[PDB]
Amino acid sequence: GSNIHYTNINYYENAASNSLNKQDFTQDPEKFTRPVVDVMKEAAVPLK
């Protein structure tokens, strides 16, 4: 996988010159998968 240690010095003035971002994480997808006002717990029925 990715190296825990490696050179990370910027040689140029503008950030546009920098190499690619190295975060690459993901986030809870709820804003897309469950964009609802009322919480609907997994163990209960959705509608009542």
Binding site: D24, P29, P46
Partner: protein, 243 residues
């Protein structure tokens, strides 16, 4: 000058390289980042969203009708309703789904799959169906008895219109190839199995009611799903440059 020795690779243009380079506008200051809803940081957020499977991909079904699984009042028991290979990246009903498109942008996949079904008959229309996942090894199950020996869920039509059958990740290896192309790579090796649906009882309706109804089929990746090795989506092509 500092003594140096340049090496192989020098001057090459690797499309996936990642170097720093001079900026055309070194002092340029971009517009501020404003608050915009819906920021996405990883496409795994997208494949986890359910989308419709083009499940009824037969000659007689055109357009929107291809999303509907036909259900009808039976006069025999234990009959089959549908069948499908669960592999998300192969040609077929899954290829046009959100999950399918992104899976087709990669060479390998892993993870459980969420197959959700919504019954769309009348409020008075009842029924029970069994949906089963058959791990690989043989051919798709030939009858309900064989199918029920695998992972499955029995769905009872009612107020809660939908049911979910989780096709758990059950694989020899941590990942599977996204194609089952055999002639060249013999990737049939990776087949993930089948999902089949059968009448558990029967679809039952009152007098003069529609004796046919539809089920919509949704699919999405589960939270333990991931993809590796980006590749060009085979569905996007062109002859000459567009004008």
């Amino acid at each position: 000058g500092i003594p140096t020795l340049y090496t192989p690779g020098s001057g090459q243009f690797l499309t996936t390289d990642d170097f720093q380079t001079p900026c055309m506008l070194p002092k340029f200051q971009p517009t501020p980042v404003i608050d915009i809803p819906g920021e996405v940081k990883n496409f795994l957020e997208v494949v986890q969203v359910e989308s419709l499977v083009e499940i009824n991909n037969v000659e007689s079904a055109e357009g929107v009708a291809r999303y509907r699984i036909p259900l009808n009042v039976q006069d025999a028991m234990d009959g089959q309703i549908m069948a499908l290979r669960v592999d998300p990246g192969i040609d077929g009903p899954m290829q046009s789904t959100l999950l399918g498109v992104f899976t087709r942008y990669y060479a390998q996949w892993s993870g459980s799959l969420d197959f959700t079904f919504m019954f769309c008959g009348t409020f008075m229309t009842t029924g029970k169906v069994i949906i089963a996942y058959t791990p690989p090894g043989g051919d798709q199950p030939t009858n309900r008895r064989q199918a029920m020996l695998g992972t499955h869920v029995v769905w009872d039509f009612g107020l809660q219109s939908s049911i979910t059958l989780v096709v758990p990740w059950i694989s020899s290896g941590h990942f599977r190839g996204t194609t089952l192309e055999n002639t060249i790579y013999k990737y049939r090796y990776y087949e993930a199995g089948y999902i089949t649906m059968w009448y558990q009882t029967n679809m039952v309706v009152p007098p003069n009611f529609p004796t046919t109804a539809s089920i919509l089929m949704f699919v999405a990746a589960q939270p333990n799903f991931s993809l590796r090795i980006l590749k060009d989506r085979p569905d996007i092509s062109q002859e000459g440059a567009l004008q």
